[PDB]
């Protein structure tokens, strides 16, 4: 964004950003299914771009 700072090295500790919720929340399964569907159809591509 600014071209005054630079990343360096090689990425380590590969993890995934995730939407956390209380363990008893009934929305878990559908949240995961919708997030996978968003990954598949390319909506995540559009949001990234």
């Amino acid at each position: 964004q600014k071209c005054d700072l630079v990343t360096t090295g090689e990425l380590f500790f590969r993890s995934g950003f995730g939407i956390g919720m209380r363990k008893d929340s009934p929305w878990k399964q559908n949240v995961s299914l919708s997030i996978l569907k968003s990954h598949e159809n390319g909506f995540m591509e559009d949001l990234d771009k």
Binding site: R14, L33, L36, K37, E40
Partner: protein, 55 residues
């Protein structure tokens, strides 16, 4: 295939094998009938290029 699962997922859905490990892609269609776990190695529809020479 015609509302029938085959292969690894086919042998797991019919509860002839509890857990399945290997090179399995997390997918939306598979998550409907089977329950996955947290991924350990990333993947996707990637592109590779022949290493061009220096100029």
């Amino acid at each position: 295939v015609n509302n029938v699962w085959n292969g690894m997922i086919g042998e797991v859905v019919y509860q002839r094998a509890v857990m399945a490990v290997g090179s399995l892609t997390i997918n939306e269609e598979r998550s409907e009938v089977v329950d996955f776990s947290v991924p350990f190695v990333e993947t996707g529809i990637s592109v590779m290029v022949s290493r061009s020479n220096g100029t």
